[PDB]
C-alpha cells in the first residue's frame, strides 16, 4: 500500500503548491506603478509579443485551408453553400481562435517566459537583487506578466482573421463559389457584440491562466539545470489541461 | 504522517476507475441493460433500405431494438427478429387480471356466446392459462411495417395496435407486415 | 525492470481497446466479409455518382457489395463488376433438393410439361443436370437498377426478381438493366 | 491519437445524447452507416505515421 | 497518456456542443453521429494530438 502513499502525498503538495502561486499572483498586481516601468514593459512585449508574430501568422493560414478544404467537400453534396462564408467564420470565431491560438502561444512564449526565470533564480541575480532591495517581484516578473496579459487577445484577433482571409483564398480562387455570396452571407449573420466581443473574453481569460501557470513555474522551480527543463515541460502539459477545460465551461455560458 | 499521505492516493484510484468503468457504460459497450426482453419475429416481402440494430417504436416511444434479418433463397422472402421491453410490452399481475376477467367477457361475450356455441367451454377454459402464462401486451392482427422518421434519418419498425384479443407469448410471429415504399415508387405512382 | 513494463502492458490494452472500437464497431470490417464471393458482370448506361465499394441489395435486405466499375470503348456502356456471395445469395445442402423437386415439378406438369416433356426423361434427367452447380435464386428475366435510401442517400444497386424458370452462373450478365435518374431526367421523365 | 480519436467520439456522445438528448440508435446508425475503415481510420494513421 | 485522455475529452464536449447548436434550426441533426465523426477521424485527431 506504499505506492498508494506516494500518488496521494504527490497530488497534496499539487494542491499547496497552487495555494502559494494565488498568493504571488496577488501580490503583483495589488501594488504600486514602479517608476519608469513604462519602458521595461514596452521592451517586455517586444519579446513575448513582437517575437511570436510570425508563428501564428503562418499558423494562420494552415488552420483556414484546412477549414477552406473540409468546409468544402461537406457542403456540396447538400448543395447549400451559402454556409461556407458562415461556417468558416463561426468555428473560427468561437472556437479554434480562443483554443489553438493559446496551445500555440503556451509553445513558444508560454514557455520561453518560465525558462528566462527559470534562468534567472540559478544564476543568483534574483538573490543579488534583493539584496539591495529591488524586489524582483516588481522588478522582472511584473513586466512579464503584462506582457502576455496584453499580448494575446492582439494575437487571436490576428489569428482570426487571417484564418477568415484563408478560408476565403482556396475557396473562390481555386474551387470557385460566389464571391459576392461569401461577405454577404457572412456580414449579416455575425453579430459584433454577441460574437467577436465575446471571442475576445475568451482569449482574456485563456491569457491569465496561461501566463500565471507559466511564470510561477519559473519563479517556484529549483535550481541544478535538470531543474529548469523539468519545469519548461511542467506548464505545456498544466496550460493545456486548463485551456480546454475552462473553455468548456466557458462556451457552455455564452452559447448555452 | 502515513495517515493522509496514504489517504490522498487511494481515494483518487477507486474515484478514478469509477470513472473509467462510466466511459465502459456510454460506450455502447457491455453496460446499458435492458429489461428481460425477448426475439419475436415477422416476415415481410421486402424491407430494403434498413438498418439492422434500429428503433422499435409501440405508438411513438422506444419498446426495443432489432436484432437479425435473413433471407431464405427458395422463396425470396426476408425475417425480421427483434427485441423487445419487459417493463413497456409487459402487463402488472392487476393488468394480467383485467383482460383475463374481460377475455370470458370477450369469448364467452353476450354476443360470442350465441353464436361461437351455447357452452363454449373451450374458449372459455383455455383463456384462463393462456393468459396465466407469459403473455405479451401486443395485440392480435396488430401489423408492423416500417417507417421513415421525418424525412432523413433512417427507418423504423412501427407497431399498428389495430384492435385486439388474442395476444402474443414470447417468440411468436406478427402474420400482417408491410414493406417498404421508397421515392421511387411514388413518383411512377403519381405520374 | 517489472515496474514499468507491466505499466507498459496497459497502454497496449488502452490501445488494443480503441482499435477494435474504431475497427469493429464504427468501421464497416464486420460487414465487409463474403463466403466464396463470386462475380457477374453487366451493362448498363447511367451509373451517375454510383461510387465503387457500395452494398447491394436484392430484396429488401443486403447481399454483398460492387466490386469496381469500368467503361467499355467499344460499345459506350459501362460495366459492373460485383461480388456476388455464394452462400446467402445462393442456397446450400438444404435448399439442393428445395430447387431439385421445383425445377422438375415446374417443368413436367402436364398442362406446362410440353416445353421438352419426357421422352425418355427429357423433362427430368434434364433439369436438373440443367443446374446441377452454381445455380441462383436468381430471375432468368430480372431487372437491376439503381436506387438510393432518402432524399440525399447513397448510391447502391438494386437487384429486382420477376418470374423466372430458368438462373444464373457463377459469372454471366443480366439481360435487362435500368440505369439511375435524377433532377436532369426526372421533369423531362414525367412530360 | 487512436486514443484521442475513441475517447473523443465517445466524449461527443455523452454530452449528446445524456445532457441534450437525441436518439442513441440513430446515432450508432448514422456513425457506422458512412464511415469506411480503408479509407478513413487507415488513413488517419498515415498521418500520424508521418507526423511522428 | 493522461495529458491525452483527459485533453481527449474537452475537445469531444465542444464539439458535442457546437455540433448541437448548429445543427437544431437545420433540424437534420442525422449529421451528429457524422460531423463529430468525420471532422475527429480526418484533421483533429492527426492536429491537435501532434501539439500535444
Known amino acids: 500500500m506504499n505506492t498508494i502513499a506516494w500518488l496521494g502525498r504527490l497530488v497534496i503538495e499539487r494542491i499547496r503548491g497552487i495555494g502559494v502561486a494565488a498568493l504571488m499572483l496577488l501580490q503583483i498586481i495589488f501594488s504600486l506603478p514602479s517608476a519608469g516601468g513604462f519602458g521595461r514593459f514596452v521592451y517586455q512585449m517586444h519579446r513575448v509579443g513582437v517575437m511570436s508574430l510570425l508563428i501564428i501568422t503562418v499558423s494562420g493560414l494552415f488552420i483556414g485551408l484546412v477549414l477552406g478544404l473540409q468546409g468544402y467537400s461537406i457542403l456540396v453534396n447538400v448543395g447549400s453553400e451559402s454556409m461556407l462564408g458562415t461556417m468558416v467564420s463561426l468555428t473560427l470565431l468561437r472556437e479554434l481562435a480562443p483554443v489553438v491560438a493559446a496551445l500555440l502561444f503556451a509553445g513558444r512564449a508560454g514557455s520561453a517566459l518560465t525558462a528566462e526565470i527559470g534562468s534567472m533564480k540559478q544564476s543568483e541575480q534574483l538573490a543579488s537583487m534583493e539584496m539591495i532591495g529591488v524586489d524582483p517581484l516588481k522588478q522582472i516578473v511584473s513586466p512579464r506578466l503584462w506582457a502576455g496579459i496584453v499580448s494575446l487577445p492582439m494575437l487571436t484577433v490576428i489569428f482570426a482573421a487571417i484564418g477568415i482571409v484563408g478560408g476565403k483564398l482556396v475557396g473562390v480562387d481555386f474551387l470557385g463559389v460566389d464571391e459576392g455570396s461569401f461577405w454577404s452571407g457572412m456580414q449579416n449573420n455575425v453579430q459584433f457584440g454577441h460574437d467577436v466581443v465575446n471571442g475576445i473574453i475568451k482569449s482574456i481569460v485563456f491569457a491569465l491562466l496561461c501566463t500565471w501557470i507559466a511564470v510561477f513555474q519559473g519563479y517556484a522551480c529549483d535550481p541544478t539545470p535538470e531543474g529548469i527543463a523539468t519545469a519548461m515541460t511542467r506548464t505545456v502539459v498544466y496550460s493545456s489541461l486548463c485551456v480546454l477545460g475552462f473553455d468548456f465551461v466557458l462556451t457552455a455560458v455564452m452559447f448555452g | ?191
Open chain 2, 1 to 191: 504522517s502515513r495517515t493522509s499521505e496514504l489517504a490522498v492516493g487511494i481515494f483518487v484510484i477507486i474515484f478514478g476507475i469509477a470513472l473509467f468503468f462510466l466511459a465502459m457504460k456510454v460506450s455502447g459497450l457491455v453496460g446499458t441493460n435492458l429489461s428481460d426482453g425477448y426475439t419475436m419475429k415477422a416476415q415481410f416481402d421486402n424491407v430494403n433500405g434498413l438498418k439492422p440494430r434500429a428503433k422499435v417504436t409501440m405508438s411513438g416511444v422506444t419498446i426495443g431494438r432489432v436484432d437479425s434479418i435473413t433471407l431464405d433463397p427458395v422463396t425470396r422472402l426476408a425475417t425480421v427478429t427483434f427485441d423487445l421491453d419487459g417493463k413497456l410490452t409487459s402487463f402488472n399481475a392487476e393488468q394480467l387480471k383485467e383482460v383475463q376477467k374481460n377475455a370470458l367477457d370477450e369469448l364467452r361475450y353476450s354476443s360470442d356466446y350465441t353464436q361461437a356455441t351455447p357452452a363454449q367451454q373451450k374458449t372459455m377454459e383455455q383463456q384462463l392459462i393462456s393468459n396465466m402464462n407469459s403473455i405479451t401486451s401486443i395485440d392480435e392482427d396488430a401489423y408492423i411495417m416500417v417507417a421513415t422518421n421525418g424525412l432523413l434519418g433512417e427507418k423504423y419498425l412501427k407497431i399498428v395496435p389495430g384492435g385486439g384479443l388474442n395476444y402474443l407469448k414470447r417468440g411468436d410471429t406478427i402474420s400482417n407486415t408491410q414493406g417498404t415504399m421508397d421515392l421511387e415508387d411514388l413518383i411512377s405512382k403519381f405520374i
